[PDB]
Amino acid sequence: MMRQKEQEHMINWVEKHVVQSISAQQEKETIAKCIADLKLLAKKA
């Protein structure tokens, strides 16, 4: 039960911190990777 509740606390804080950071992260390499992915699906399509 110790490792269970510490695991739950850990996983929820990880998800909350991910929301906190990536909600305020824009540097257009997201969109660059996404257009690269459309390009890759174009080459394989």
Binding site: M1, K5, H9, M10
Partner: protein, 54 residues
């Protein structure tokens, strides 16, 4: 890297720990976490059958 205790826990963390630990105290009794006891030494005492005469 944020070791030295569970991170940013708050009091209800330890409250849930205490309720779960309290139910776990209910599931065995009031024993100790070390130096276990063995038993209480009982004595089987079967009464002697007797007879006046056969």
């Amino acid at each position: 890297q944020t070791s030295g205790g569970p991170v940013d826990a708050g009091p209800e963390y330890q409250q849930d720990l205490d309720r779960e630990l309290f139910k776990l105290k209910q599931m065995y009794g009031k024993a100790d976490m070390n130096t276990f006891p063995n038993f209480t030494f009982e004595d089987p005492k079967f009464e002697v059958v007797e007879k006046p005469q056969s």
